[PDB]
Amino acid sequence: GENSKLNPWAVVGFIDAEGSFMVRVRKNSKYKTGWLVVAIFSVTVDKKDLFLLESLKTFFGGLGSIKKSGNSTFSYRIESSEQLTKIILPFFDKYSLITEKLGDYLLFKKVLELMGTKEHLTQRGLEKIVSLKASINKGLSEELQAAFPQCVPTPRPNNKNIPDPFWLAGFVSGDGSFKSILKKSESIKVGFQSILVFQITQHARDVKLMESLISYLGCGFIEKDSRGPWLYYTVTNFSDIQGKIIPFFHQYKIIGSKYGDYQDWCKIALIMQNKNHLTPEGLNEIRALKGGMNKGRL
DNA sequence: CTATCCTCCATTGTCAGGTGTACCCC
């Protein structure tokens, strides 16, 4: 992959799920103020999905660079402030993020506006720029909080509607899951219950977004993780899966290697619709599918 | 001295893959 098309909204949504907007503040005395301020737009994915990055680079007029990142990952990064301001900002202005990522990108925009007028090289301009980063991402880490302990983080912005179905496709490609389970049953003639599940995981920040999905897809529910601020919107109900989840993502296809999961998922869902899952032969047919899907892919 | 390229982490939070059992269907 390298070409494709990518739906503007698919892209936005995918980014709402997987993207980072980074405003980095480096110590270097060779710089007038004592600091280098760099601004980055990053996406990072498994070797599985290098071709997505490629198609993403393409989508953004061919800008940026695709590079080995971690042991098993690759990264697509726009690091040039000009390039960012020229390609990235106008896009995301028109086609707004709807996660709390919007909030990140919005701050990100101001730094790239300060850096634009060159006020960042200036002193107090930096101070403003750090007040921004303060409320971005994880926030300040050690050195930043130490060199700048006097910094009042700037106010975080607010609102939350799904702009387009394709947004959800894209978004789900990032932070969504098509689970297949085999639960050891003690009341079935083949010994195991076959369960399909559809999941979307997300941080409790976006509780309001997630809550809405139930309304949006006309099914599902939200469970909080016992151990943190992790929401799972979930659909376990077979009839809903077959009549709402599948037809949706059939129409608004999944972008990435997860698409291939959705397919094998559907392939099971047929085998379940025909009651063949209570046979040993069709149960087997399932094991193979699931075995070679998700964490066991390629 | 400022801007972009570039090659490298570490930590922990998603994904993903399971249960315990209320309850509907025969």
Next chain:
DNA sequence: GGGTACACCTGACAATGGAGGATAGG
């Protein structure tokens, strides 16, 4: 007497989200 769905449980390793450098230009 066979089969389903919600609520709940739980861990590994990729996704966060960085970290320096080396440049080449003004």
